[PDB]
C-alpha cells in the first residue's frame, strides 16, 4: 500500500490477540506500546521524546501483525501517548518513505 | 527518492540561508526546529509527545528547502531534541509511506 501523510498514518496492529491502533513513525527508533501486559523476560530502559524521557520495559522477539505483515521483534511498553511503530519494525515490513 | 529506514532519515534542510540537519518524521503533525531566529510575527504554542510538552514559537509561511524541494509553511521553533520535519511539510515535498 501507499499511505498519504495528510492525516496521521494510523494502522491496526494485532499483538497477543489484542487489536490496537498504532502510528507508523519514521521519527522513532523503536516501537513503543501503551502500558499492557506481555509475557516473559524484560529489561528496563529509558527512552527520549520531544518532551523529555520515559521509563519503559523492553520485551524481545515479540510477534505482531502490522497491516497483514507478520513481524517478530523488540517492543517497548510504557506511558507513550499513542502506540508507535518505529523503524525497528517498519524495516521488517519493507516500509520506505517515498517522494 | 525512496528513503529506507535502516538508519534515522536525516536530511539537510536550508532555511534563511542556513544549512541544518533534520529528521523526516511521519509521527509528527508539525515541523519543529531547534532555537533560531526567524523573521516576522509569531505565536506561542504548546506541543506534546513522548515525555510531555514543550513551549514553542509558531511562525507562518516560512520558506524552507528540503532535499532540494522548495516548500513554504508553518515552522515551530523551540527546545526539540532534534530538528523535525513533520507532516505539514512532508506532504508538500510529496512524501508517502510505501510497503
Amino acid at each position: 500500500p501507499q499511505i498519504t501523510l495528510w492525516k496521521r498514518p494510523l494502522v491496526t496492529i494485532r499483538i497477543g490477540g489484542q487489536l490496537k491502533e498504532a502510528l507508523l513513525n519514521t521519527g522513532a527508533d523503536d516501537t513503543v506500546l501503551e502500558e499492557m501486559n506481555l509475557p516473559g523476560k524484560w529489561k528496563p530502559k529509558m527512552i527520549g521524546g520531544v518532551g523529555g524521557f520515559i521509563k519503559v520495559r523492553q520485551y524481545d522477539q515479540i510477534p505482531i501483525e502490522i497491516c497483514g505483515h507478520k513481524v517478530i521483534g523488540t517492543v517497548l511498553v510504557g506511558p507513550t501517548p499513542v502506540n508507535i511503530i518505529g523503524r525497528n519494525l517498519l524495516t521488517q515490513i519493507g516500509c520506505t518513505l517515498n517522494f | 527518492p525512496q528513503i529506507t529506514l535502516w538508519k534515522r532519515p536525516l536530511v539537510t534542510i536550508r532555511i534563511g540561508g542556513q544549512l541544518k540537519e533534520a529528521l523526516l518524521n511521519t509521527g509528527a503533525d508539525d515541523t519543529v526546529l531547534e532555537e533560531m531566529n526567524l523573521p516576522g510575527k509569531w505565536k506561542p504554542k504548546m506541543i506534546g509527545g513522548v515525555g510531555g510538552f514543550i513551549k514553542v514559537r509558531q511562525y507562518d509561511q516560512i520558506p524552507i528547502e528540503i532535499c532540494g524541494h522548495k516548500v513554504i509553511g508553518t515552522v515551530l521553533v523551540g527546545p526539540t531534541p532534534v530538528n523535525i520535519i513533520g507532516r505539514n511539510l512532508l506532504t508538500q515535498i510529496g512524501c508517502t509511506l510505501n510497503f
Binding site: 502510528l23 527520549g48 521524546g49 507513550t80 518505529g86 | 509521527g27 503533525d29 531534541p81
Partner: peptide, 10 residues
C-alpha cells in the same frame, strides 16, 4: 492531543 512522537533509543 499531543502531536510530535519523535522517539530516541537509550
Amino acid at each position: 492531543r499531543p502531536g510530535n512522537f519523535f522517539q530516541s533509543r537509550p
